[PDB]
UniProtKB/Swiss-Prot annotation, chain A:
Protein name: Spike protein S2
Region of interest called Fusion peptide 1, as start-end residue ranges on this chain: 21-42
Positions bearing carbohydrate: 6
Positions of the record's site feature: Cleavage: 20-21
Function comment: Precursor of the fusion protein processed in the biosynthesis of the S protein and the formation of virus particle. Mediates fusion of the virion and cellular membranes by functioning as a class I viral fusion protein. Contains two viral fusion peptides that are unmasked after cleavage. The S2/S2' cleavage occurs during virus entry at the cell membrane by host TMPRSS2 or during endocytosis by host CSTL.
Region called Disordered, residue ranges: 33-49
Organism: Severe acute respiratory syndrome coronavirus 2
Length: 49, 39
């Protein structure tokens, strides 16, 4: 309760293991990535699929 | 960021000293005197 102001859509939602809000989830889902190599991908590059 | 040989992980948290990768930092601490890695 913050005087009737609703902050539940920008405060974190701890239901998921990444403590992110709803609007932050939309922002992270809308920006599509090029799948950069910041996570290792040598095993996937070795296995020719 | 790959894997690290020669530094032992600790279940603590300090300020970053040597940045390694995705949240992992390394330092030269006493827990003897050796290189440790942490979050
Ligand atoms: C805040 O908004 C959400 C969705 O817009 C709603 O589910 C929630 O009940 C609201 N909070 C309060 C205290 O009514």
């Amino acid at each position: 309760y913050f005087g009737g102001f609703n902050f539940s859509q920008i405060l974190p939602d701890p239901s998921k293991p990444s403590k992110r809000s709803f609007i932050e989830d939309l922002l992270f889902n809308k920006v599509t990535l090029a799948d950069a190599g910041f996570i290792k991908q040598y095993g996937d590059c070795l296995g020719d699929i | 960021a790959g894997c690290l040989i020669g530094a032992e992980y600790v279940n603590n948290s300090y300020e970053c000293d040597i940045p390694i990768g995705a949240g992992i930092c390394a330092s030269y601490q006493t827990q003897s005197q050796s290189i440790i890695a942490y979050t």
